[PDB]
Structures are given as structure tokens and as C-alpha cells.
Design a binder for this molecule. Structure first.
Ligand code: MG
Ligand code: MG
Ligand code: MG
Ligand code: MG
Ligand code: MG
Ligand code: MG
Ligand code: MG
Ligand code: MG
Ligand code: MG
Ligand code: MG
Lengths: 63, 86, 273, 131, 93
RNA sequence: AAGGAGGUAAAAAUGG
RNA sequence: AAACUUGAGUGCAGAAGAGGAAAGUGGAAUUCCAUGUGUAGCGGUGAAAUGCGCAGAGAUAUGGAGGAACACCAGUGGCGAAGGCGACUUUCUGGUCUGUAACUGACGCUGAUGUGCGAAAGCGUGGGGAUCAAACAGGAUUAGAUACCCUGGUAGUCCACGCCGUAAACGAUGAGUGCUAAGUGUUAGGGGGCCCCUUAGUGCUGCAGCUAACGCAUUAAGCACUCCGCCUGGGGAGUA
């Protein structure tokens, strides 16, 4: 399949882009696995770091 | 060291213009790197991983110095007195 | 910090001392000195009422500003000095109007640093503020019990307390002893921990050094006679030989509590040590 | 790192012969070229080409297979090595496979075969056995 | 070296008090040879979880560029001391 | 469909 | 003695990373303390009992104290010489890989003796102490049970600085170098048109060859060269 970030060409992920992060976050707030979301590993790392930043800044929930 | 400082050092010690691979240039840059890592370790004593790379650099500089001393004694003496590495 | 002597003699063997690297001036401020003759544990009747005090080196008293009531004016730490009258060191500070005072030297206070006191002071080591204005969680020392009386709590070397919470008229504090108690929020405290943290580690090493400190020898109860002590007498060595160990004056002295009842502070003391 | 180019060349030849390759390209040197020429003259290989390019040049050997696809080169063995060098006299020159094989030798009169060494009555460093 | 500093001010803050607080902390981030490239406010936003029992927070974003991090360190120290800022974070880039 | 690698539950009397 | 750029480094342009050190921030959860509601059980096991609880336990709600570890991401994935490294943020810092062809011109490999790092337990000094838990106490099982199981529980488990220097410290596989069919994944790149080629890793399958066999097989245990370490029947004994 194809990766959202690879297709859209975006080469950076901003932790304040809560709407985008909600795409890859689960219903309960867990980070969806790469094999499910289709994302590449390179951008999966960026996504995890951005999601944890947002959790710290309370933009996104933990649980 | 910063690439700017490295450029300054290579300009200072290059045998001729465009020379980046001379033993003098390599060992001067290695001296700068060794001093920087020593200054880092003085604060971060327990950084064994960094110190290992420091020792690799020291050995590389030692082998370059051995080669230079074997090839041209006068150049070796001049370089070591310039760098204060004896 | 701690210097370990070589065993050149059996007296020096295992002895240690402070290196005094923190001290930056080895003589005191003349105008802040007062005489301190020794009592040797003898009261106004001339009788020994506390044992084991006497002799020891002559000492001058350094007047110390425990009150820290000179507010809104900066003071610069001129020096850190030795003080024979207490475990902590003392910092001579010089106020911007030219008045000089000694304070307890906090851990980390450096020569040339600035300190201030008052409700508006910043929360940094050596500044003095009402507990009203000190945040929760801050480590403090030289804590007042009555506003304006001067610090009485957490003044020894390494001492500190922690602000825990703020009730209406009182602030909760955890003292070095582990006691948690209330203190009037108008009472002042100094930010930080008292310096000279290695004080307690010193191995005094020999009897003479205690004598220099003015401590006379402690004779154990069990090696006196019955008329001297409840533990006295018995042929040869003897065990305590009664239900509880006793003080020289005939009171039980192992586990027996002595804090008096019906004290005003009992409703301020939230948790004992 | 590399320590015996002659051993490397012999092992290249052996590996190519085992896999039944037709040609074999290796970095060149004068001793290697002389060895290859001796092999060709004796009939163990088919052809030898020298490519006079940069980087010391290249040798391109062409291996020889008989009828029934039988391998002409049965085996190559390094004799003298950097770790232990072997020399022999003219009267002590060894015969490989009772004479059915060659011993490549290095002599004051150039690197030759054991037959030529015995004929000229000279000895030298026994580089290799080929059979 | 650039830095993005995000902080949250308690929801129950008077307008003038919040204005003074934001001005003070922007000045702090500007002091130590650090140039405030741009400061903005994202308004009061719902928090994903209660912080100090607050369900809302005034979000302030600041971008400042400096050759060191003294201004950022002073900001963080004064934000820890402060009882008006609930959360803060500094990101290099 | 059959084999290889990681994690991971639930169960448990005793002696042959 | 004189040249060369292929090995080895350097410069230039790029890539990823739980590599390391120090400070700071954060959510979940456990334990404890206080208080409101509430009644007679809770807990535990194969089944039980010890134990806790009518002085109000357990449950439930709120707040506080404190220590420790970082759920999801997470992957034959990544990094490191090995040990090892997984919340986030900042500072300092090591190494590696890719392309280029200015630059040096063999400056390389190995490495006895030496000098450092080295899981866990353990030792010293000073802190800290939630959880778990040697020792230990009680209960159970049993012919007995110095155990497995249950209830507690100290060292320790955590931090700093020193010490110790060992593990099935393993790929039970020393380092360097070249050469020898193929198919198919994945990590980080590069070049030419989803395809092809290519570099460095990381897996699986599998020729030739090797092997006592099992199996290994471009990440060799094949073919070769250099250097180091090590072996020579089992016990005695890693003992004297
Ligand atoms: Mg006494
Ligand atoms: Mg007597
Ligand atoms: Mg009596
Ligand atoms: Mg008696
Ligand atoms: Mg007797
Ligand atoms: Mg340990
Ligand atoms: Mg147990
Ligand atoms: Mg061993
Ligand atoms: Mg082994
Ligand atoms: Mg590969």
C-alpha cells in the first residue's frame, strides 16, 4: 500500500497539528501501529515523537 | 569542532592551497578534536563511549605522526612544536 | 571536602577533618564580635547542672542576623567565614547602604552573589521571605516560629525544611527531624539548605580533640557506686539489673517520652518525627 | 588486509575452475603475468590477456577444459608463503605428481618451471604446485 | 539556533493579569541576547485532561532565536516558580 | 496449504 | 633511491539512529495517610488456613505523601567494540552509512606484555525506600517439606562516589583481506527508466564446496593468505 506522508510529500510533522495526529491516534488515544496505518517507519518515528509532544502539552489525551 | 573552525585549521596548516589530506592538516584537526573531547570529558567524566572515540582519534594521530617523522624529520619537529603536542 | 589524615600516629589513625575550602576569609569582622566566656555547664547558682561541659578553646561570638528584616535593599556576599559557635559557616554580606551583617551561609552561596529579603524578593538561595510568599515545595532554612523574633529552626550544617502546603493563617512544613508541623505564614525563612554538608562526617579521631571542643568525659552509670547512680554497684561487671535503664537522676531513659502535655504547639504539630 | 597476491591469484583460479567458469579477471602484476604465461605454455589454461589500464592493469585468464568437460587443472597449491618461505636446490627440485605436474619456481634466471630449473641446474623459491 | 516555546496560563486569570504575565515572559525570552522572532496567542483551549484541576488553558506560542539558551532557561525557571503558568515546553526546531 | 521466528494469555492436590 | 592510487584517512554534499553524559517536565499504576458513605466480610488456594476486619475492614469518592518504571508506538526494526540502550524536553558529546572525486601517497593488518570498559549479585560511605523480595516468621502440602503454594517480611532492588571484574559475558563461531550459483523480504541511502541498477546493513530459502552427522552456505562452518588466543582421554581440579 501507500503512506500518507510519502504520498502527500510532507517531510515534517508538527506536534501542534492535532487534527492530523487524530488520524493516526486510536479511539482510546493509543498510537495506531504502522502495519495498520500504512505509514512508513521513517515517518512513524516522527509521528510517535509528535504525538508524545502533544500529549505532554495536553493537546492530545493520554488515555 | 565546527566546520568553520575546521576550515580555519586546514587553511592554517595546509602544505599548499587545496591541501586537505596532508599529515599536517589531519593531525592539526585531530589535535583540535582531541582537545574538544577532553574539555567535554572534564565535565562529563562518566562518558566512556565518547572517550573511546577520543582514544581512536589519539591513535590515528599517533600513526600519522609516526609516518611524518619517518618521511621528513624537520617537518615533524616543526609541526609538533607548532601544535604543542609533545 | 573531607581530608583523611595518614596514620603517622595512633592518635591520627582514622582521623579526618574538613578541608575548609569553602572559607574565603580567615579572620572575622571586628565590629560584629562580642566576648563569650565559658559557663562549663554551671548555672547562676555556680552549680554544675549539665554534665560534660568545660574547658575548650577560647571563642568570640559573631553577631548573626537571624531576623533578616532589612528588606528591599540588596546585599553582596563579601565572604564566607568560619564560626566556632555553630556547625554552619557564616557569610558576611554588605548591604547597598554600607551596613554589614553576618548570616548563616547556605549551601552554594558564593562570594559576590546578591541576596535580598522581603515579600517581593526572588526565590533564590539566601533570600529571606515570609512563608506566605514562599512557594509550596521549596527547601528553606532559618525558619521563624514567631514573626520578627528571628530564625530558630533548621540552622545547623546541612539543615533544611520543605514547605508542603498553605492553610489559612499557617503554612505546613516538613522539618529535618521528619516532623510535619504548622508555622504562622507571617514567619520568615531563607531559601535553600544550610551549607557545610560534610560537617557530620568528620572522624574526631582522638580524645584531646573533644577536649579542645570543650567536651569533658562521660562516665558510664554502670561503673559508679549505688549512691552515685541507679546502675552503680554490683560485684564485677553487672547488667542493667532492673526493668528499665535509668538516668543518673533516677528516671527511665530508654523509650520513655518526655514531651510535656497540654502544650500550645500540640495542635500545630501535624505528624511527629 | 591482502598479504599474498600470488595466493589470491591461485585461489581465484581454483574457485573459477571449480565453478567451471570460462574466464577470470584479476588485478595484474609482473609475477602473476609470468605465472599465467607459464600456465599457458604448459597447457593448463587456454589464453592470457593483459589489459594495460590504470591501477596496475588487469590479467584476463581463459581456462581450458578437455573432452567430457574434464578439468585440465586438477589442483593448485601455494608452496612458499609470507609466513614461511621455501627454497630448493637444483638437485633437490621436487617433481609434482611424479612429473605429471609442474612446480612454478622463481630463480635468478626468471620464474620458470621445475623442468627448466633442473635442466639449467638452478634452484630458487618454489612458488607453487600445479597439476 | 531557533526555539519554539509553548506555555499554558491558568483559565481563571484576569485579562490585565494575563497581559502583564505574557508581557513579562516575552521580555524574559527576549532578554539574554535572544531575539523574539514572533509571539502569538491561540486563545483559551480545552485541555485533554485536567491540569491542577483546570479543564481550560490560555495557550501562548513564542518563537525566539538565540546563540545560547540563557533566556529559555530563565523562562523555564520562572515558569516553574510561577503559579500562573501550568505547562511549558521548549523545542529546538 | 505446509513449515520456520517474537510476544502472549487461562488451567494446575499428592504418590506410583 | 624514485613514482602510482586501487588499501587506509582527509575535504566537499547528504542520512538515520532506545549510542553516551547532565539537568528539567509529564501521564498511568502500586503502597501509605486523612476524611465522607457503608456493613460483616476481605484475601487467598487444587482445596484451605495463617493474616487483615465489628476499635468499622474490604468496596467506593476526594485530597495529600513518596519511591520506582515508562502502556500504545514496537517491527528477523535501530544504535553501540562488548556489556548494553525504549516517556518527553534542552545542553555537551562518540560512532556509523551514502555520493563525489579536489587532497596525502601504503601512512596498512594483527597484536604477547600493557591499559580501559564490562549484565546481575556483592562490598564501603552517604542518601533514599513505592513495588518486588534472598534471610526470616506464620499457614498449607507431605511419611517428613529447612521447598514448590499462601500471608507477611529485612538486606537488596533506586541515587552519588569508590570498590569488585565475573555470567550459557553465546552466533557456544577471533580479527583483517580477497574470491565462489541463485530466489525473496526489510532498515538507511544513491543512480537510470511501477520497473531496472546500485551501496551498506538486517532476515529467510538454497547450489557448488565443506561436514561424523546435525547442518553452514556472499552475514560460510566453502576456497585461500597474514597475525593473535586456545586444545591434546575422564576424574582429581579450576583444587593444592
Ligand atoms: Mg553528655
Ligand atoms: Mg568502682
Ligand atoms: Mg539507688
Ligand atoms: Mg545493678
Ligand atoms: Mg559476675
Ligand atoms: Mg547491582
Ligand atoms: Mg513469599
Ligand atoms: Mg569466563
Ligand atoms: Mg565461550
Ligand atoms: Mg544483504
Amino acid at each position: 500500500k501507500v503512506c500518507y506522508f510519502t504520498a502527500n510529500g510532507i517531510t515534517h510533522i508538527d506536534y501542534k497539528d492535532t487534527e492530523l495526529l487524530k488520524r493516526f491516534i486510536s479511539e482510546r488515544g493509543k498510537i495506531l501501529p504502522r502495519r495498520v496505518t500504512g505509514t512508513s517507519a521513517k515517518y512513524q518515528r516522527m509521528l510517535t515523537t509528535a504525538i508524545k509532544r502533544s500529549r505532554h502539552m495536553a493537546l492530545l489525551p493520554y488515555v | 569542532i565546527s566546520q568553520e573552525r575546521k576550515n580555519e585549521i586546514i587553511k592554517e596548516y595546509r602544505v599548499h592551497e587545496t591541501d586537505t589530506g596532508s599529515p599536517e592538516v589531519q593531525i592539526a584537526v585531530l589535535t583540535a578534536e582531541i582537545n574538544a573531547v577532553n574539555e567535554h570529558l572534564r565535565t562529563h567524566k562518566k562518558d566512556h563511549h565518547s572517550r573511546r572515540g577520543l582514544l581512536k582519534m589519539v591513535g590515528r594521530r599517533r600513526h600519522l605522526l609516526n609516518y611524518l617523522r619517518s618521511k621528513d624529520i624537520q617537518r615533524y619537529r616543526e609541526l609538533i612544536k607548532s601544535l604543542g603536542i609533545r | 571536602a573531607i581530608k583523611k589524615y595518614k596514620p603517622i600516629t595512633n592518635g591520627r589513625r582514622n582521623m579526618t577533618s574538613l578541608d575548609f575550602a569553602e572559607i574565603t576569609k580567615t579572620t572575622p569582622e571586628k565590629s560584629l564580635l562580642k566576648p563569650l566566656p565559658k559557663k562549663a555547664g554551671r548555672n547562676n547558682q555556680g552549680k554544675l547542672t549539665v554534665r560534660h561541659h568545660g574547658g575548650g578553646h577560647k571563642r568570640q561570638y559573631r553577631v548573626i542576623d537571624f531576623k533578616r528584616n532589612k528588606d528591599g535593599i540588596n546585599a553582596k556576599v563579601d565572604s564566607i567565614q568560619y564560626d566556632p559557635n555553630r556547625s554552619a559557616n557564616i557569610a558576611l554580606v554588605v548591604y547597598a547602604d554600607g551596613e554589614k551583617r553576618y548570616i548563616i551561609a547556605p549551601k552554594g552561596l558564593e562570594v559576590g552573589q546578591i541576596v535580598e529579603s522581603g515579600a517581593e524578593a526572588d526565590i533564590k538561595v539566601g533570600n529571606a521571605l515570609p512563608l506566605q510568599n514562599i512557594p509550596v515545595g521549596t527547601v528553606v532554612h532559618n525558619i521563624e516560629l514567631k514573626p520578627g523574633k528571628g530564625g530558630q529552626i533548621a540552622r545547623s550544617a546541612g539543615a533544611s525544611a520543605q514547605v508542603l502546603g498553605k492553610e489559612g493563617k499557617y503554612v505546613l512544613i516538613r522539618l529535618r527531624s521528619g516532623e510535619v508541623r504548622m508555622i504562622l505564614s507571617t514567619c520568615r525563612a531563607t531559601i535553600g539548605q544550610v551549607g557545610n554538608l560534610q560537617h557530620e562526617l568528620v572522624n574526631v579521631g582522638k580524645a584531646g580533640r573533644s577536649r579542645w571542643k570543650g567536651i569533658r568525659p562521660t562516665v558510664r552509670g554502670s561503673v559508679m557506686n549505688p549512691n552515685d547512680h541507679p546502675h552503680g554497684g554490683g560485684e564485677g561487671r553487672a547488667p542493667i539489673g532492673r526493668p528499665s535503664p535509668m538516668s543518673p537522676w533516677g528516671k527511665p531513659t530508654l523509650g520513655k517520652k518526655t514531651r510535656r502535655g497540654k502544650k500550645s504547639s500540640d495542635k500545630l504539630i501535624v505528624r511527629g518525627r | 588486509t591482502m598479504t599474498d597476491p600470488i595466493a589470491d591469484m591461485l585461489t581465484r583460479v581454483r574457485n573459477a575452475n571449480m565453478v567451471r567458469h570460462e574466464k577470470l579477471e584479476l588485478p595484474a602484476s609482473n609475477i602473476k603475468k609470468e605465472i599465467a604465461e607459464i600456465l599457458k605454455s604448459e597447457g593448463f589454461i587456454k589464453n592470457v590477456e593483459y589489459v594495460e589500464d590504470d591501477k596496475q592493469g588487469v590479467l584476463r585468464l581463459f581456462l581450458k577444459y578437455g573432452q567430457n568437460d574434464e578439468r585440465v587443472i586438477t589442483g593448485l597449491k601455494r608452496i612458499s608463503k609470507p609466513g614461511l618461505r621455501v627454497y630448493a636446490k637444483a638437485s633437490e627440485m621436487p617433481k609434482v605428481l611424479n612429473g605429471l605436474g609442474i612446480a612454478l619456481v622463481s630463480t635468478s634466471e626468471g620464474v620458470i618451471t621445475d623442468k627448466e630449473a633442473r635442466k639449467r641446474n638452478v634452484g630458487g623459491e618454489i612458488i607453487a604446485y600445479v597439476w | 539556533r531557533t526555539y519554539e516555546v509553548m506555555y499554558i496560563v491558568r483559565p481563571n486569570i484576569e485579562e490585565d493579569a494575563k497581559k502583564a504575565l505574557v508581557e513579562r515572559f516575552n521580555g524574559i525570552l527576549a532578554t539574554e541576547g535572544a531575539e523574539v522572532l514572533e509571539a502569538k496567542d491561540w486563545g483559551k483551549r480545552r485541555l485533554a485532561y485536567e491540569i491542577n484541576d483546570f479543564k481550560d488553558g490560555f495557550y501562548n506560542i513564542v518563537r525566539v532565536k538565540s546563540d545560547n539558551n540563557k533566556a529559555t532557561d530563565e523562562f523555564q525557571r520562572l515558569a516553574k516558580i510561577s503559579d500562573d503558568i501550568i505547562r511549558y515546553m521548549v523545542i529546538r526546531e
